[PDB]
Amino acid sequence: ALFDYNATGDTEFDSPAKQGWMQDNTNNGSGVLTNADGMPAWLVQGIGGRAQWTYSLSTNQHAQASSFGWRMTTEMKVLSGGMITNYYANGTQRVLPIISLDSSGNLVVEFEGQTGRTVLATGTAATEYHKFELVFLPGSNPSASFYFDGKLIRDNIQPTASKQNMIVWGNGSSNTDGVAAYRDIKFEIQGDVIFRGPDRIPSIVASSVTPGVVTAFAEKRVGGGDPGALSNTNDIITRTSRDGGITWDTELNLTEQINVSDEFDFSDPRPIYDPSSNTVLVSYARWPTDAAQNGDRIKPWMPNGIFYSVYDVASGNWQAPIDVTDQVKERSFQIAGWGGSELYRRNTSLNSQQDWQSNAKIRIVDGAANQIQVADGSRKYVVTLSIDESGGLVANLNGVSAPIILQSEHAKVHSFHDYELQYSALNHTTTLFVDGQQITTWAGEVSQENNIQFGNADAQIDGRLHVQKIVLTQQGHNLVEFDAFYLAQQTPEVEKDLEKLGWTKIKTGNTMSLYGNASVNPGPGHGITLTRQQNISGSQNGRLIYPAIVLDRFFLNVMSIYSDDGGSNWQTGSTLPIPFRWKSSSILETLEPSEADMVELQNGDLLLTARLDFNQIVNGVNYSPRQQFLSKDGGITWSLLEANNANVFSNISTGTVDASITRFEQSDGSHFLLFTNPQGNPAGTNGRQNLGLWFSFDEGVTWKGPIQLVNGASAYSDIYQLDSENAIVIVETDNSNMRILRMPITLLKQKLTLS
Ligand SMILES: CC(=O)N[C@H]1[C@H]([C@H](O)[C@H](O)CO)OC(C(=O)O)=C[C@@H]1NC(=N)N
Ligand SMILES: [Ca+2]
Numbered sequence: 001a002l003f004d005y006n007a008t009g010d011t012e013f014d015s016p017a018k019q020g021w022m023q024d025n026t027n028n029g030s031g032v033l034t035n036a037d038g039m040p041a042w043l044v045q046g047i048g049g050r051a052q053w054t055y056s057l058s059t060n061q062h063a064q065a066s067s068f069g070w071r072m073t074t075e076m077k078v079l080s081g082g083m084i085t086n087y088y089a090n091g092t093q094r095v096l097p098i099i100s101l102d103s104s105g106n107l108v109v110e111f112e113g114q115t116g117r118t119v120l121a122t123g124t125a126a127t128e129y130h131k132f133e134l135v136f137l138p139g140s141n142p143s144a145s146f147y148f149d150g151k152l153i154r155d156n157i158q159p160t161a162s163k164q165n166m167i168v169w170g171n172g173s174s175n176t177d178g179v180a181a182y183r184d185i186k187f188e189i190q191g192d193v194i195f196r197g198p199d200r201i202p203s204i205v206a207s208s209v210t211p212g213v214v215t216a217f218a219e220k221r222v223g224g225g226d227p228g229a230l231s232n233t234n235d236i237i238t239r240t241s242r243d244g245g246i247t248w249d250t251e252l253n254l255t256e257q258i259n260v261s262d263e264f265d266f267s268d269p270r271p272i273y274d275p276s277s278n279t280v281l282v283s284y285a286r287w288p289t290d291a292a293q294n295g296d297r298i299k300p301w302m303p304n305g306i307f308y309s310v311y312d313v314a315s316g317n318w319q320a321p322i323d324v325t326d327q328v329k330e331r332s333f334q335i336a337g338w339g340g341s342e343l344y345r346r347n348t349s350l351n352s353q354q355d356w357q358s359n360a361k362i363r364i365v366d367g368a369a370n371q372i373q374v375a376d377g378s379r380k381y382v383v384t385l386s387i388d389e390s391g392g393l394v395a396n397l398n399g400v401s402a403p404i405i406l407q408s409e410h411a412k413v414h415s416f417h418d419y420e421l422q423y424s425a426l427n428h429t430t431t432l433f434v435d436g437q438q439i440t441t442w443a444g445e446v447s448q449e450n451n452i453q454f455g456n457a458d459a460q461i462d463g464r465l466h467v468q469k470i471v472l473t474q475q476g477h478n479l480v481e482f483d484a485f486y487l488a489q490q491t492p493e494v495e496k497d498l499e500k501l502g503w504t505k506i507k508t509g510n511t512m513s514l515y516g517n518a519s520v521n522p523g524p525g526h527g528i529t530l531t532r533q534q535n536i537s538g539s540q541n542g543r544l545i546y547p548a549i550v551l552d553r554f555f556l557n558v559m560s561i562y563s564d565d566g567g568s569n570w571q572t573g574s575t576l577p578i579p580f581r582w583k584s585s586s587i588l589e590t591l592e593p594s595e596a597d598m599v600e601l602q603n604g605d606l607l608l609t610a611r612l613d614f615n616q617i618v619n620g621v622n623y624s625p626r627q628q629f630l631s632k633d634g635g636i637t638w639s640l641l642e643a644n645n646a647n648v649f650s651n652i653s654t655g656t657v658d659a660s661i662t663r664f665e666q667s668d669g670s671h672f673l674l675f676t677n678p679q680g681n682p683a684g685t686n687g688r689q690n691l692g693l694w695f696s697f698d699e700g701v702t703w704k705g706p707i708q709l710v711n712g713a714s715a716y717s718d719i720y721q722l723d724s725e726n727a728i729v730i731v732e733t734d735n736s737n738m739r740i741l742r743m744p745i746t747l748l749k750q751k752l753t754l755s
């Protein structure tokens with residue numbers, strides 16, 4: 001909430017009384033409206049008496065200011081004397097700066113509860129207009145900092161005892177003469193509620209093309225629970241501000257229009273601001289109302305998916321939801337030959353004296369020893385697919401010496417491809433096609449086997465492959481037809497077990513296989529539009545991207561979901577690389593990255609920070625509740641940043657919770673990273689308390705802070721640059737009430753520099 005006086009000659013607001021301020025003069029103290037040079041100002045003439053203006057605040061407003069902070073901004077020039085007192089008192093305490101011209105004619109400041117004056121300006125500048133700012137940060141030991149034309153003058157100013165209760169400006173002394181002219185006074189109370197608990201899971205973005213336009217999101221939760229609870233209906237809600245996040249329009253339910261029979265929960269609103277179109281595109285998860293991500297109750301035959309809505313900033317209009325599920329929710333049979341091998345084989349009756357064809361639609365997720373094989377009673381043909389050290393897609397053929405690089409561009413490397421073997425009876429050789437393109441011809445090797453086989457073939461070579469289709473054809477008839485894309489999404493009365501469908505399973509060591517994915521979910525926070533991708537091969541400026549949560553069957557991980565055409569069509573990247581170990585029980589010990597946020601670094605690399613849910617220890621190594629990852633190819637693939645986990649955020653909470661990360665760019669061209677998360681109470685303990693703000697000035701190698709932003713409850717949060725000097729924060733607080741902070745980043749960062 002903002003309380004202000006703005007000097008203007010406009011007869012409709014041409015004095016402080018007309019703007020709700022109370023006159024508080026004594027004796028010969030007075031004031032008058034002046035028009036020095038086109039710029040109106042209120043001239044406070046505190047000669048022979050006091051001359052000030054006051055604004056009263058309620059008990060609640062004072063309490064809010066104490067919990068969530070406040071800031072006071074004055075534009076004034078001092079003409080003469082002293083006791084120029086612009087300050088805030090809450091009934092028990094005040095921070096009182098006292099501004100004056102000293103006996104040398106210089107502009108100086110003192111603070112009650114402190115000895116000493118500081119010279120702010122000398123010479124002609126002493127009596128010119130300046131911007132004076134007081135910023136109060138909450139906490140158990142809260143303090144204020146004072147800035148002069150944007151520069152930190154005094155930090156850690158302790159509030160002092162006062163029974164006064166008001167916002168005050170002018171000359172607050174009967175005895176001490178003081179004259180000053182005021183253009184503007186602003187007092188802002190931080191932390192206004194924008195979405196009420198038990199609604200949850202906030203996110204926020206701002207428009208750079210139309211300054212002042214801010215759009216925030218949350219889950220409307222009827223019944224107050226996570227998605228997936230029968231007879232309860234969650235929707236996505238949004239509000240827009242057009243004055244920089246001060247006032248907000250009517251809460252709008254985005255999804256009820258596609259929830260007309262109460263069958264769904266929607267969750268995890270993930271907005272992206274696109275400056276090229278000046279739009280906000282927000283993606284969110286759909287769940288059946290009675291099954292979702294928690295407890296892995298969601299299954300691939302259920303209507304989990306992802307939808308998006310578009311906000312046109314110029315017109316203020318919302319575009320109806322659009323389903324992108326088929327583009328981003330993979331349906332496949334997945335074989336993870338991690339620490340083992342798993343193959344499926346069936347005997348066939350191929351005639352090697354007739355042509356035959358096989359089609360396999362296969363994605364290589366990682367590793368090697370991933371095979372598709374046909375033997376026709378005379379010869380055996382096996383294609384082994386792998387990802388090499390540099391991230392290329394490689395085929396090796398039996399009986400052929402040299403490997404074939406099928407693709408080196410990382411996006412295409414991890415995509416599905418259409419493999420076709422065309423056997424020619426005439427030539428007694430087989431031609432390999434990939435995505436319609438003739439690759440090579442080879443004779444395979446002599447064999448009396450007659451079968452088709454696929455999977456991961458070696459217990460000593462890790463590999464994961466996903467299969468959508470395996471077909472074998474001869475004389476126009478499909479001898480074998482396995483459609484995992486189809487089967488993955490059928491209800492459970494449909495037979496899907498390969499071993500009950502005429503295949504033989506051959507397994508060694510430990511493996512995991514499944515029809516998936518069970519669900520995809522954009523996750524909590526905002527996404528980004530890329531602008532520094534010039535030197536990132538395969539990538540493109542204007543890419544829309546967010547780090548989504550994918551549940552394959554029982555394990556969570558994160559992958560990029562992105563669009564290179566403004567959001568019309570979407571693609572998915574690879575999941576985060578994570579360590580694994582098989583426990584004695586043939587149960588998988590690994591990590592589950594979930595709620596994630598990313599930012600584009602100066603060089604076009606992407607930095608990702610992820611919540612690590614459930615188990616955090618793999619092979620005796622504790623990865624903490626948070627882990628950072630780096631992408632060098634525009635978000636297609638990632639690497640785990642060793643020793644860059646919760647440890648880099650000093651005094652961060654030790655409990656799992658969603659965080660936020662974002663870029664901040666100053667008007668002089670410089671930039672740095674901001675990050676928000678609860679500190680816990682006390683800081684560094686497990687608790688959704690006391691939101692902290694961390695800074696990185698070296699592209700995410702180290703973090704400074706935290707600066708405490710909130711006193712009390714603090715859970716999920718999201719931070720975004722509002723303008724050249726401020727960032728806007730939305731944060732869950734008491735009873736999950738979601739509150740707005742508008743933070744003077746360029747002022748606050750000075751608390752972290754040399755003193
Ligand atoms: C999809 C979903 O239900 N996500 C949960 C999330 C989840 O339970 C944990 O990350 C465990 O995997 O945590 C909780 C949480 O407050 O810890 C909020 C999220 N609620 C909503 N996004 N609505
Ligand atoms: Ca987040």
Ligand code: NA
Pocket residue numbers: 046047048049050051171172173174175176177178
């Ligand atoms: Na006076």
Ligand code: NA
Pocket residue numbers: 227228229230231232233234264265288289290
């Ligand atoms: Na529900």
